Design a protein around this ligand. Structure first.
Ligand code: HEM
Ligand code: HEM
Ligand SMILES: CC(C)CCC[C@@H](C)[C@H]1CC[C@H]2[C@@H]3C(=O)C=C4C[C@@H](O)CC[C@]4(C)[C@H]3CC[C@]12C
Ligand SMILES: CC(C)CCC[C@@H](C)[C@H]1CC[C@H]2[C@@H]3C(=O)C=C4C[C@@H](O)CC[C@]4(C)[C@H]3CC[C@]12C
Lengths: 479, 467
């Protein structure tokens, strides 16, 4: 059994399978980490996910781990997690199944030119999905009540699925069927994801296991080749699977399920929280409505449920500081990411207050929700302030302080440094696009107090609400 | 990682913290083990509770692990579990903090003469609690009712009574009860190796319980069980435990005496009232025994040891209740690498591996117990109305067919006392109250899979009125 040696952080006893475990027995991961801070100070070690994880919780020390460092491996743990949760052989190029640099693939196809086409495609897809079936106005005249999470889930999943994996236009009559099946199968697989990253076998979850494998079946190359308007990301990944890997057909299908998960698992809860917080807070709703109305006015874009679609420029979509602030403030409150790297050798990590001996293969982790909810940095941290990331000029605020010192890293739901989401710009675009179309197509009302976060997914990104909340919507801008 | 070697059972990949985990993600421990049985056959290995656990699921092979064997250590895992969950240094005499043989201590003080005085004391304590204060219906949750009655009675029987301040004892009892609920709630997690400081309320509850069981506080009490009196003595003369650790050893015994008894009592009561035929048979049996014993009920019943034991209808109701609700893990640890020879196969076992039975698989086997999910109150009654002991698997008569208390060396030392206390409770319920449900049968809560008698996922309400 492991014993603390001199210079190593305080070592907590106990085995924690995963961060969101045991909520039914009264666990609370945020409060658990905060209790460890009070007990041990800003650095402490836990046995978590079968590793020894050093938590660095001083915001002033984040820069020392988020920089590139000779002793940091920022891919090892993620590679192992993917192989384990999705079921494929090692994608670590050291293990010889592939020579692809996947970071390079993502950056090339989610940023730059590729981001522009993705963004246009998402906007077309969102409009096809959110617009009512071309029929009488009486069909869409009344208020409709639905769970908001459930609504966001189906719109964003379908739009995101078709944007990333293209569309099958050979059989249009059955695509509602296939999408609903894919949607249901993804819900069932993602449900058990916290357990899978803990090392629990997917065999323990029969329906989830079946769902994962049916999803993989739909993403076999033979099936993707039937589709049109496929993202450059998946086109390239198909090509690099074929030319740079020795993966079998199923494993190639699994690599696309990985990307499906990556594109959906955070975006869906992010969209929910942004919509909810916007509707819940009258000032936010008012500010967002005016910003979007003005942008569409200035861009000469008419809103209609049928006919001409909205086409915004890349600058018009990016220069939406009120929507940006609403999204950032929604993620500040809901984000529960683990930012990780693995010690390449024994070394001493030099931080703000102290220096700490780290062993080879130990994990050095940040849990930035601790910073996001820190009242020293964000006064009234549990309050949604739609303008929290707006300065006096109504532009995006970038000045935040801890102990009077200006923070470089103050907002981290996408990570930072090398450990950062390559899809972040596309994510912000798709949420903005969703919000724009919601404000433009619908009148919107709640029926609802703010649900707590579901911490069973602690470490996996944006936390969903513990329970859905009902809202009502009604189409506007009819003929 | 571990690789399955030649001759070893099929090895399931993955890591299972504890058997009742991940229910919120759709896990089902019983169906998981059954699925593995279909997939792999009667023997398979899982990484469970940080060990490599070989499940032996053939009822015809149980006898080969329930015998004393050169390679079976049947104490190591339990010792390690107690230290972890309750917080004390090793009680393994090999580790040098005690020379007590705790198994001997329990047998000496829970069986024989000691059993007779425990049983007499439990009846007095139950009657003290259940009697009317010195004509309305009361509606209550049945589990909640069984909990408070059996906890109080069992606590006072095992740990005695503080008679110096009678005026505050209901307050002290209610605090102990609340604290025990909060501690026991997280028990499944603790046996997985999760730290108790992950559960602030439960941690505080465990230590407040320990505080009340310090020797200084036990010495204030009277009519203490011989079990706790001897345990106190052996703490002092045979161990080098500190005061807190000595208190924790008594908390261990409090848990042992309560955590299975309470759910057992709920199920026996619930199944008896729910099933008219069972209620009629139990009522007639108790009536006849009390009449033949010259015992009249009123606002002290003194049954002989023979009179309490010879209650086959009540015995059958309790057995059939535990057959349905029991989720025990019967465990031993391999002392060395060896080949285990079972009915159909031989399997290589590594030193420090666990060899496990999960008897719920047998209890709910339709080959052994036809219509296994139906409560049949007379399932353990033969044609003569005596306790039935003849059960078959593939036509072969089973030695081990009813295992909620374990079997062999790995058997609950309090089992006889346990059956007495549930019988006494049922006797008093039938004798003192009119009883009505307000209720379809709750499913079992499998979060406690491995820990004994599973409670219902939800309580059910019932009414009771003093006769
Ligand atoms: C609100 C939406 C999203 C949030 C909060 C989010 C958050 C994250 C976080 C925290 C990581 C891990 C960063 C690290 O510590 O290394 C990550 C990785 C990743 N994300 Fe996102 N993400 C979002 C949307 C998307 C979208 C729409 C895509 C579309 C393809 C995407 C693709 C990825 C990929 C491919 C990785 C792994 C990169 C690698 O391992 O090289 N994400 N995301
Ligand atoms: C329905 C009631 C009860 C059930 C179902 C039950 C069940 C069990 C089971 C399955 C074991 C583990 C046996 C093994 O596999 O090694 C056990 C151990 C034990 N039980 Fe019980 N029990 C019950 C009542 C009691 C009561 C009332 C006491 C009172 C003191 C008690 C004291 C113990 C002790 C001390 C051990 C550990 C023995 C040792 O480690 O040497 N039990 N029980
Ligand atoms: C098969 C290959 C072509 C692709 C492999 C890419 C794998 C390694 C990438 C793709 C998406 C990535 C996850 C992600 O999107 C978000 C988070 C949130 C953060 O809090 C914890 C890490 C986590 C779960 C990432 C883990 C690594 C993943 C699975
Ligand atoms: C401190 C010492 C004086 C006493 C130590 C005794 C410890 C080792 C004894 C006392 C009570 C025993 C538990 C028990 O009652 C019932 C079960 C159910 C079974 O399904 C799994 C094992 C389990 C949890 C036993 C584990 C070992 C325990 C804690």
């Amino acid at each position: 059994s492991r014993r603390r040696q001199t210079g190593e952080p305080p070592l907590e006893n106990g085995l924690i399978p995963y961060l969101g475990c045991a909520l039914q027995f009264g666990a609370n991961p945020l409060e658990f980490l905060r209790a460890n801070q009070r007990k041990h100070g800003h650095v402490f070690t836990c046995k978590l996910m079968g590793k020894y994880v050093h938590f660095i919780t001083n915001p002033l020390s984040y820069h020392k781990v988020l920089c590139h460092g000779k002793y940091f491996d920022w891919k090892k743990f993620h590679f192992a997690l993917s192989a384990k949760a999705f079921g494929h052989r090692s994608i670590d190029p050291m293990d010889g199944n592939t020579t692809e640099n996947i970071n390079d693939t993502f950056i090339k196809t989610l940023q730059g030119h590729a981001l522009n086409s993705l963004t246009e495609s998402m906007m077309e897809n969102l409009q096809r999905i959110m617009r009512p079936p071309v029929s009488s106005n009486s069909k869409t005249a009344a208020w409709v009540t639905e769970g908001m999470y459930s609504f966001c889930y189906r719109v964003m999943f379908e739009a995101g699925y078709l944007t990333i994996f293209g569309r099958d236009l050979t059989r249009r009559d059955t695509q509602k069927a296939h999408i609903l099946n894919n949607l249901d199968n993804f819900k069932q697989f993602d449900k058990v994801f916290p357990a899978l990253v803990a090392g629990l076998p997917i065999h323990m979850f029969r329906t989830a296991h079946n769902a994962r494998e049916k999803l993989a079946e739909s993403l076999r190359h033979e099936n993707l080749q039937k589709r049109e308007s496929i993202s450059e990301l998946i086109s390239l990944r198909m090509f690099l699977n074929d030319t740079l890997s020795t993966f079998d057909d199923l494993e190639k299908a699994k690599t696309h399920l990985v990307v499906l998960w990556a594109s959906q698992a955070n975006t869906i809860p992010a969209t929910f929280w942004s919509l909810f917080q916007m509707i819940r807070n009258p000032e936010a709703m008012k500010a967002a409505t005016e910003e979007v109305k003005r942008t569409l006015e200035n861009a000469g874009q008419k809103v209609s449920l049928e006919g001409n679609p909205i086409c915004l420029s890349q600058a018009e979509l990016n220069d939406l500081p009120v929507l940006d602030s609403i999204i950032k403030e929604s993620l500040r409150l809901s984000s529960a990411s683990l930012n990780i790297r693995t010690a390449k050798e024994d070394f001493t990590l030099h931080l703000e207050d102290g220096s700490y001996n780290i062993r080879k293969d130990d994990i050095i982790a940040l849990y930035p929700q601790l910073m996001h909810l820190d009242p020293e940095i964000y006064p009234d941290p549990l309050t949604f302030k739609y303008d929290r990331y707006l300065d006096e000029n109504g532009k995006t605020k970038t000045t935040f302080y801890c102990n009077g010192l200006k923070l470089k890293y103050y907002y981290m739901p996408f990570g930072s440094g090398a450990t950062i989401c390559p899809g972040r710009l596309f994510a912000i675009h798709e949420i903005k696009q969703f919000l724009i179309l919601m404000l433009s197509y619908f009148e919107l009302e709640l029926i609802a107090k703010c649900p707590p976060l579901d911490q069973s997914r602690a470490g996996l990104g944006i936390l969903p609400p513990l329970n859905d909340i009902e809202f009502k919507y009604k189409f506007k801008h009819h003929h």
